[PDB]
Amino acid sequence: NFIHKLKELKQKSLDKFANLLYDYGGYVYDRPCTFIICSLICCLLLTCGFYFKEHEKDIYKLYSISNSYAYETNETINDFFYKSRRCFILVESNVNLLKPKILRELQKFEEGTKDIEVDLSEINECKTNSELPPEQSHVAKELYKTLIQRSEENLKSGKINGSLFDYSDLDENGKSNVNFTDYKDDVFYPYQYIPPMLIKADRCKLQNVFGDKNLNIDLREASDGLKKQITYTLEDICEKKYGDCNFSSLFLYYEKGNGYIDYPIKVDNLDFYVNRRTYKEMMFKGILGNMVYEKSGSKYIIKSANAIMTVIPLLNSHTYEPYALAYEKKLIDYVRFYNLDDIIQDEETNDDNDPFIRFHVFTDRSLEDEVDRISKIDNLTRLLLLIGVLLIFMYALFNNVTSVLYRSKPLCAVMGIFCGFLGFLSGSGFLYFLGVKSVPPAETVPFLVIGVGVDDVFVILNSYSLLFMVKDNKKRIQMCLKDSALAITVTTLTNIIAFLISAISPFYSICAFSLFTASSLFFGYLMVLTFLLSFLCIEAKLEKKKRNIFTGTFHLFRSISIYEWIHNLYLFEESYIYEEPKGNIGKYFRSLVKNYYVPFLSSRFGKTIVYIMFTIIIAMSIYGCTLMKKGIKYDKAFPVDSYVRRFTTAKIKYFPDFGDFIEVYYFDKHFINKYRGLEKLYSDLTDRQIMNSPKINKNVHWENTNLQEELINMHNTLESQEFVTSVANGFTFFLNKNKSSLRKENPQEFYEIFANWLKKDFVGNLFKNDFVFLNGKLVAWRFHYFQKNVDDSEISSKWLKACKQITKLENHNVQMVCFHLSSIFNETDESIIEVTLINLGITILTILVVTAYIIKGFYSCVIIALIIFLIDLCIFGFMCLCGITMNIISMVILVLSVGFSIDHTSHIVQAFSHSMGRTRDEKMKESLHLMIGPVLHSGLSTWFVISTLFFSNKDFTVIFFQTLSLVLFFSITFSSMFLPVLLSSFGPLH
Ligand SMILES: CC(C)CCC[C@@H](C)[C@H]1CC[C@H]2[C@@H]3CC=C4C[C@@H](O)CC[C@]4(C)[C@H]3CC[C@]12C
Ligand SMILES: CCN(CC)S(=O)(=O)c1ccc(-c2csc(Nc3ccc(C)c(C)c3)n2)cc1
Ligand SMILES: *[C@@H]1O[C@H](CO)[C@@H](O)[C@H](O)[C@H]1NC(C)=O
Ligand SMILES: *[C@@H]1O[C@H](CO)[C@@H](O)[C@H](O)[C@H]1NC(C)=O
């Protein structure tokens, strides 16, 4: 019942679709020019949507997951801690930079950095046309006023008395829409600390940012010239150290006459030196690079150093967000354009090359700026696209031009390339009309689309090449379209399905890439059906009139089943319609396949050769699967010549120890929840469930001696790690300095002693900015440590996880969050495996269902599934073997590999099934002779368009090219060599 009825319905539907396409081709043949002009007009109207093109530049949006826990941690850190923007300025040289002349020049360079002036007209965030002051909640404003008043009063008083605070454990709700009464009695230590989330002042008023300048200007209500008159310098937005700017540079040694530039520098400690005159700290390890010293006379005498680093701290608050964002920009223009080669020319080098001195810069603005620059498509990508288009045009012309000119189809190939390009343009325009923003990966959308947009073309030509016997050109075109309609529709539908399923991934970059590719493929399919088919009709009319393109242009200026046919041909071979005419489209290639390749495959020697070769390939794939690596470094997304990558390379070169600045934070859950109230498919929610335990980070007694000893042991363990070079933990210093005083374990005593140590001690004065006390209880704190830089992301993620394990203190319900910039990318690399393993399964199931709906028989579907699984296994094994890691690009291409390879596999299998040969060998011969041309062409075209990406300056594009080339190579080999042999051996017969 079910088997009969479902198969009957399927066959009836397929036959009706074929007849509909037959009649559609018949209708198109009468109106080719009308279809051409209408399709072109529609494509241009859709392309007009490029005027609404937008780029997505947020790194979190592009690369992070939707519910990334790193995003939540960054939000918490910014809401409750005072971070400072850090501008790094590095200077490299094959010449030692410690000579007095170069030192004087670099001092002038630093003074120039200090002397940069920015006018208020450059503050793009105050343009008199924005709603920049959103409404802050009323209770928050009242609390901010009360807290600033209390901070002023406490700072004036300068007394620490924890006798009035309540030290009892908080309730589950935090007790001993939010009411101001609960918040109005909060006392914060240090007294100048107020939660940065509460500092929401009018950013466009100069009084809120520059009190000293005494100007009362509303930038949203000020003219452009009036704002341009007023200027500010570095000193107005720079973090202060004893009043002066808190510069971290070599020239702190010479400050206030402590040392002299001409004389050699002598320092009593190469790790932490305090300038006696200025009382300012300085770490020579972080400043100087390839440092060479003497260590004589109980001190260290530094002779040479081939690198110098300077760190400029800028205030990082809401009100100071734009101004710094302005100054940093100018700072970059001051560094990337600075030249001091004149002095360098004379001095002796290290590498014996021409002497050199290069300045590098890195800011928090730099990554966003580089992403913005990358978002626009560069000239190199356009040149590569042009070269790929030229290659595919040459290949198509070479295949479709033969000895006889009027039987050739060059115009069809050219218009097929044009159909691919127009489909890409129309799809991109439609999605821009829908509002989807263009991610940088979309730069690779054109190539791929063209690489697919030609495939259907070849298939149609194949059918039109096989129907030379039909004298009626209109009926010939109708039958050609009838034969090729199911194949073309299934191919495009499968590609669209694969890309749409890929678009489900949480990362917006992949979602946009897949959406653009799917829309472009759909519109390219429509263009193939109309624009290309009309040109096919025109060239068929010219062929019937026996005039080629040139003669036709001159005159215009003057003015039966194919399987049955191949079976009959092979039966006649056992001894007008059987023999192709001279100069046919695919005569020579089919002759080569039938005369040489088919006898090789049918021979026993060919079969055993193929079996041995593919056994070796599968074994190599398994061994590669054994060598599996995961993760890609983020900077690979940028070109090597970008100043960010150059700065990173240099830093790694001259400063191996100071690789990553990992920051470890502890937040009290009750405090965080109390102060947050003022603001008002994929289950890989990693690093979130652990931190949400009901009994963690709540009312932790820091006065406990056991907990302090555990903290000391944790610090020692963190120092013991090989990948950790230095640790800056103020809590450890406090505990080491004071042990007898803390024996009482009294919470009030602990609070008072910690406050006094922070307020009075020199090291405490340094660490004052890393601790938050509310109502006499330490509610949040932090420390930092440096991690060796490594080129492998997987080992870096392992180090971060080891650090998270070390910071865990389950005995006292304490776990500290470890954070870094690379944490987001590590989270993405950890989630990509699960995301891909889900998407691949969903894609495979859907594609198998779709192909089983169209493939005749059930055993053929099993063969197709086995071939698809083997192709995927080989692709993954060789991508692991070739050093490609399991990253976003490789995983997405692995997902799409099913949709790409199913086309060739289905072509060969359906050609085998529909044939009427008696033995398996005859059916294999017919299947090859019919559909080995299109299968080879549809892969060679895609690879020819893609190959130009091998020279792309962006490593992500290179990985894309490599993985796609592996996919295409394995699909072609398993569809043209392994599949025919497998069908000859065990293929179905009835
Ligand atoms: C002389 C002995 C007894 C004490 C000196 C200890 C040294 C190694 C410690 C104490 C103070 C520490 C600094 C305190 C604060 C900061 C700011 C932070 O953004 C980076 C780390 C940095 C710069 C720390 C580096 C290490 C440091 C300099
Ligand atoms: C550092 C901040 N970034 C995180 C890496 S990012 O802004 O999100 C970012 C991400 C990627 C690129 C990029 C350039 S070329 C490129 N080819 C590419 C081609 C095809 C596919 C499927 C993919 C994924 C990529 N992709 C550029 C920037
Ligand atoms: C703290 O305040 C209480 C309440 O007035 C007072 O009794 C105590 O002496 C104060 N402690 C100090 C050190 O001033
Ligand atoms: C504000 O008032 C009550 C009484 O003090 C307080 O307990 C509660 O937090 C608030 N009431 C609400 C939210 O209904």
Residue numbers in the entry: 5 to 180, 292 to 674, 721 to 736, 1047 to 1151, 1161 to 1470
Please quote the authors directly.
This transporter consists of a large membrane-spanning domain formed by 12 transmembrane helices (TM1 to TM12) and a large extension formed by two hydrophilic loops (loops 1 and 2), consistent with the signature of the resistance–nodulation–cell division (RND) superfamily of proteins. Therefore, our cryo-EM structure depicts that the PfNCR1 transporter contains two domains: the transmembrane PPM domain consisting of 12 TMs (TM1 to TM12) and the soluble PV domain composed of subdomains (PV1 and PV2). Combined, cryo-EM, Chl efflux assays, and molecular dynamics (MD) and targeted MD (TMD) simulations demonstrate that the PfNCR1 protein is capable of exporting Chls from the PPM to the parasitophorous vacuole (PV) to facilitate membrane homeostasis.
Our high-quality cryo-EM map also allows us to unambiguously depict the location of bound MMV009108. This inhibitor binds within the tunnel created by the PfNCR1 transporter.
